[PDB]
Amino acid sequence: NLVIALHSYEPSHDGDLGFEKGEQLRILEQSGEWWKAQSLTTGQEGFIPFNFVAKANSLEPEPWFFKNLSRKDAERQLLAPGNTHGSFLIRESESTAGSFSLSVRDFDQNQGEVVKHYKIRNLDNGGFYISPRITFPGLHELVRHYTNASDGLCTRLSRPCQT
């Protein structure tokens, strides 16, 4: 039963478990507002405020995932300096239930900066795809695949868009 620390914590009361942002902890007891958690590193266990951790692999903490972004918003943000070719982000679709959209910094034929948009369609049960030939159990796996090979995308995904 595993979670990632959202911030660092230094024990205030006793019985408290200190931890650090990004640390992985297993949850031994889910009862109340203070959970009994286990450190995957040190094997250590104590009580933590529950709002300081999240399920691992959850979508929101991903540096490439952006909330409340329209197509034009994403395009704007990706064009802004600090982002270069290959920079990318994924946002939830505003017009279609269950689907997402990938935006990737690209170059036109004049070596000018442009942004390319790809619909990420959802598969009736588990997964996601851009091309129906290539499917993934989830968005993390999709991002990982196209980081490694562009496979029809304008370029391989590199740096998540700057916040």
UniProtKB/Swiss-Prot annotation:
Origin superkingdom: Eukaryota
Phosphothreonine PTM positions: T96
Sites bearing Phosphotyrosine, chain numbering: Y129
Region (Interaction with PTPRH): 91-163
Tissue expression from the record: Expressed specifically in lymphoid cells.
Family, per entry: Belongs to the protein kinase superfamily. Tyr protein kinase family. SRC subfamily.
Disease: A chromosomal aberration involving LCK is found in leukemias. Translocation t(1;7)(p34;q34) with TCRB. Immunodeficiency 22: A primary immunodeficiency characterized by T-cell dysfunction. Affected individuals present with lymphopenia, recurrent infections, severe diarrhea, and failure to thrive.
UniProt-recorded name of the protein: Tyrosine-protein kinase Lck
Residues of the full protein shown: 64 to 226 of 509
